[PDB]
């Protein structure tokens, strides 16, 4: 039982649970600020992604839809299905100390349950059709809504890729590690609106604090 | 008591003990094997040894050879200071699958104990004079000899520093991870019996077997 804020926040995950334990000691945790960067011959990551966004729930944490089977993405020539996608305000990551009012988490996970996190950040701009979809059909805390019109998470990629890529960590408990991050440079957007809407709906802040990168570097794309 | 062979050896290191957990759980640990490589404009890293191998110290599990302070390196803009350096055999890294028969460890240290390591490889050929005048005075076991004349860590390593670098652990318990892995490309030579010596005197293997890269990627210096 963990929140942002309190008894509960970031600084007491590790503490809570002994499942919690890589929150506190931990050398490669997620969100960080994305400053060490270096020039790496990185591949684009090729991604087949299908309309399967098909319920959407809110765990009072996040507003997270859920995808069925069929999509996915590679890295390192290993497949991992996108499970599912998620949102925090403002964003976790910085880029060279910026801080976004949005960011969108896709979740994959492959044969042997290896994350691999797509993070996404927005700032303010126009209403977006594909956000404005979900918020209609924004549930309640605990609550879970199914959609006959299915969500496409493609069309929340920026049209350009280039990405950074590091070695982290889940950003909620039990934040372990060996998960792989791939961080879109372009910036998407949402309405400010969109973003208020978000935020009274989790009770504020939604981010964990950025984490020391430690001994890591952040690759970016050629 | 942990050690590099049965019930204490590397595969029940991280039950032994509650402060050797990273060792089981870890996810960015090391060694590995450089194989999932990616070009990278890393920076030339930046050496300034002196002559100061003070003493040699046998704990068992390694000859070390401690440093006097004033030889540092610089990483990340970071001065780290060497401490000291000791010995593998066969190497605990591998480069694409290739192993290496006696690997020589550099551990340095910063301001607040975060550690950077340099690893250097060396197969077989003529004695190396370095590693003699290191051998020719080994101490009892567990105790320490001061050397008379300072020994220059600089001289062990090779012409060439191009190197790997990727974020990783100490190879021996307690395993803490965070640790700045910069291993040199070129192979350093010393003799088939400057090996056997050494061998014989730790009783066998003293490398922990590669673990897997994970999340992480290799980067290689352009
Ligand atoms: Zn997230
Ligand atoms: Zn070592």
Redesign the interface.
């Known amino acids: 039982h963990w929140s942002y804020h309190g008894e509960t926040g970031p600084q007491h995950w590790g503490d809570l649970k002994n499942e919690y334990?890589?929150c506190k000691?931990?050398?490669?945790q997620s969100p960080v600020d994305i400053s060490?960067i270096?020039?790496?011959?990185?591949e684009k990551i090729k991604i087949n992604y299908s309309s399967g966004g098909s319920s959407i729930t809110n765990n009072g944490h996040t507003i997270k839809v859920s995808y069925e089977p069929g999509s996915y993405i590679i890295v390192?020539g290993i497949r991992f299905e996108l499970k599912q996608f998620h949102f925090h305000a403002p964003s976790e990551h910085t880029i060279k100390g910026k801080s976004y009012p949005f960011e969108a988490h896709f979740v994959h996970a492959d044969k042997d349950g290896?994350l691999?996190v797509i993070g996404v950040i927005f700032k303010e701009g126009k209403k977006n059709p594909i956000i404005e979809k979900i918020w209609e059909n924004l549930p309640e805390a605990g609550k879970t809504i199914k959609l006959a019109h299915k969500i496409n998470a493609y069309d929340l990629l920026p049209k350009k890729k280039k990405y950074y890529?590091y070695?982290?960590s889940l950003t909620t408990p039990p934040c372990?590690?060996?998960?792989?991050?791939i961080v879109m440079e372009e910036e998407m957007e949402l309405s400010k609106e969109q973003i208020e809407k978000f935020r009274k709906l989790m009770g504020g802040d939604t981010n964990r604090p950025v984490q020391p990168l430690?001994?890591?570097?952040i690759?970016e794309m050629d």
């Open positions: 334990i890589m000691i931990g050398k490669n060490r270096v020039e790496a011959e990185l390192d290896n691999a890529r070695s982290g372990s590690e060996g998960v792989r991050w430690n001994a890591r570097m690759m």
